[PDB]
Structure formats: C-alpha cells, structure tokens
Amino acid sequence: SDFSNEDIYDNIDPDTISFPPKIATTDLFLPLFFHFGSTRQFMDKLHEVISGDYEPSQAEKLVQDLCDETGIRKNFSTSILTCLSGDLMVFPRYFLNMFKDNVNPPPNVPGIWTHDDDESLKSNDQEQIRKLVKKHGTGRMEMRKRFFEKD
C-alpha cells in the first residue's frame, strides 16, 4: 500500500537531534560537517546531494560529492553505500537513526544491512533467513543475494 511500517524509520524529526550528535565523531566526519547549523540543515543538504542525476557506475562521484558538500569522510560514505546495497533512497534513513539512537551503524533498521545480517544470509539456516526477510523483505533479500554473488 501507500502506507508502510517502515515510515517510523524515515519519520524521525531532525529538530529533536542536538547538533553535532554525540555519535558524529571526527573519524567519520570532516571539519565542514560540524559547521552545519542544525541536524535539519545537514539533512536538507544530504537530500540535495543524494537527489543528483547520478548513474549506477558514478558511486565514486557521489562519495566525492558527499565529502565535498556534506563533509562525510569518503571511507564512511563507501561503508554506508555497501551496507545500503546502493539504495540511495535509504541514505537519509541511515543518518537519522545513527544520530537518534547514537549507534553506528544502526542495528535493527530495514535496509541497513549489519555484519550479523550478512552472516545470517551466508548460512542456509531457514530460521535466520526468516528473521532477515522479516527485517528487510524479499526485495532487499534478492538484491543482497545479487549484490554478493558479484562482490
């Protein structure tokens, strides 16, 4: 439907997040990042960049643009992109949950593939696989399968 129980992961108000968040450490963000006025100001810039007319190959450009425009260290953006399986849509969801919950990476968030999530996918255990498909869905599941038979 138009509705999704994933909305609660996107719905986070950036005005309730004190800036800079405690989780936003110098080893993940450049000095420019700490000069955004609010969490909303950063979010609005992140949305602006992410919405660029990129082509699937141009991950190297996006990582550079995220570094220059939003002050996210290149290696952290690459780390994020790998865990999102390239889904630029779930990029604003990553930071809102990372900042609200003060955990990096956010553990139980649909679309944010943890290390333990990948270890569960590696095993052919139907119990672990049910828990994964209940977290991310069959769509993200087949996308993650397609992703690692390559990576």
Partner: peptide, 13 residues
C-alpha cells in the same frame, strides 16, 4: 576504487 567500481547505485525517481 576497487569496491566503488563494482558498486552500483539505485538513483532517485
């Protein structure tokens, strides 16, 4: 450079 070449983006509508 290695990961980024193989990594495919899912752009916005």
């Amino acid at each position: 450079f290695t990961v980024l070449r193989k990594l495919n983006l899912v752009p916005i509508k």
